[PDB]
Amino acid sequence: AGALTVSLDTVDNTAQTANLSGTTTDVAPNEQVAITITDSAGNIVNAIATVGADGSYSLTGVDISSLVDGSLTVEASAQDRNGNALTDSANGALDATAGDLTVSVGTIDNTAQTVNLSGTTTDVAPNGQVAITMTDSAGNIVNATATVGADGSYSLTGVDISSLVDGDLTVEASAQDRNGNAVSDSANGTFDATAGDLTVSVDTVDSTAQTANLSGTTTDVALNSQVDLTVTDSAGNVVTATTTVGADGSYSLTGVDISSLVDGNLTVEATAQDRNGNAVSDSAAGSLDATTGALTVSLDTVDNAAQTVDLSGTTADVAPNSQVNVTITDSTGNVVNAITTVGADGSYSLTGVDISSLVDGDLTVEASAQGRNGNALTDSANGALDAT
Ligand SMILES: O=C(O)CN(CCN(CC(=O)O)CC(=O)O)CC(=O)O
Ligand SMILES: [Ca+2]
Ligand SMILES: [Ca+2]
Ligand SMILES: [Ca+2]
Ligand SMILES: [Ca+2]
Ligand SMILES: [Cl-]
Ligand SMILES: [Cl-]
Ligand code: NA
């Protein structure tokens, strides 16, 4: 019975050659064995060997540089002496080329929110797929796919990354080489499609509780980012507050303690950091009136012999070292004007004020000072001059 065997004895990955041998039964010496070596892409090497006196055959250094990596199938064929078709096959693996992949960002288009990518491969089959991942600073992901060309290159144009947020973008690309090995590369770049912004507003100043409610909005500020706030009063005193941004970019803080601040204008400033590392800020005006302005005046003494008066008074919500303006008007409209200073405790006095220019009869004392909320705070007192 006619028989043929073939074996693939060696594949030399460096020389890109193979050594084959086989045996025959009932094949005439000097007949030929036809050989094909087929690769993973269907490329064929054709070879021929002669059957020896002992029925054996071999080929050494067969050129397989035309073949691609992956499985090799060897097919041998011959005819026995009576013409019967004989066949056998053998198998091996070729790994003459190291698998590799590169990926590179051509552009991140901040205006269109798109990315152009390109890359190269080695030992990845044309029409192979490259799995592409783009990951943002928040862990959002865009998936994409590209087809490997004849030269092993791949590219994508205008991939939509409008679903990603600003900051570092990581691009990962992966494929499989013809020996079944994962090949991968990554690249990185900056995404800055959204202008960072922050607003702040004074919702309420509760002058009874001496608290403030503050809120605002942000653009391009990451979830849980810290907002630092300052509240500044009319004397330069500062209260600090802090809160965090929500998913919609809003922030709120209720019951901020401003008992340490004095009455008058407030300035609130808020600052956060956007996704591209910029400080974004806003300021807003408020008003504090925890203490009702007041002024009293008293005519303490009229010295009719020296023609003088002693005056005193009290204030509430008048900054110490403010001026108090005092007028003393007599019964015919003559006026004495004086000025003194509000003390640490809000009190003021004038002693030995000369009223020798006034005439006998009624005296009216008027005192005025500016409170911290900008009011003219006044009081009067009445007495008499009897110098003649
Ligand atoms: O209120 C806003 O929307 C933003 N701010 C501008 C924010 N400023 C703050 C500052 O410089 O003090 C610019 C910035 O945040 O750097 C006012 C405006 O431009 O309408
Ligand atoms: Ca290979
Ligand atoms: Ca940005
Ligand atoms: Ca006040
Ligand atoms: Ca008199
Ligand atoms: Cl031969
Ligand atoms: Cl006032
Ligand atoms: Na008078």
Numbering used by the authors: 27 to 414
Quoted from the paper:
To expand the reach of the ligand-binding domains, RTX adhesins maintain a central extender region of multiple tandem repeats, which makes up most of the proteins’ large molecular weight. In this study, we analyzed extender regions from two additional RTX adhesins, including the long adhesion proteins from Marinobacter hydrocarbonoclasticus (MhLap) – an oil-eating marine bacterium – and Aeromonas hydrophila (AhLap) – an opportunistic pathogen of fish and mammals.
Calcium SAD phasing was used to solve the tetra-tandemer structures to 2.0 Å (MhLap) and 1.75 Å resolution (AhLap). The repeats are rotated relative to each other around the long central axis, producing a handedness to the tetra-tandemers reminiscent of helices. Both the MhLap and AhLap structures show right-handed rotations, with pitches of approximately i + 3 and i + 2, respectively. Regarding Ca2+ coordination, the MhLap tetra-tandemer is once again the simplest of the three. While the MpIBP tetra-tandemer was found to have many Ca2+ coordinated throughout its structure, MhLap consigns its calcium ions to the linker regions, with only one ion per domain interface. Each calcium in the MhLap tetra-tandemer structure is bound in a similar manner, forming an octahedral coordination sphere comprised of five protein contacts and one water molecule. The protein contacts are made by the sidechains of one asparagine and three aspartate residues, as well as a single backbone carbonyl. Taken together, these spectra demonstrate that the MhLap tetra-tandemer develops into a beta-strand-dominated structure upon Ca2+ addition, although some structure is present in the absence of calcium. To analyze the potential rigidifying properties of these interstitial calcium ions, molecular dynamics simulations on a di-tandemer of the MhLap were undertaken with and without the Ca2+ present. The di-tandemer maintained a rod-like structure, with the Bend angle between the two domains never deviating over 30° relative to the start frame; the two domains saw slightly more twisting over the simulation, maintaining a ~ 60° wedge.
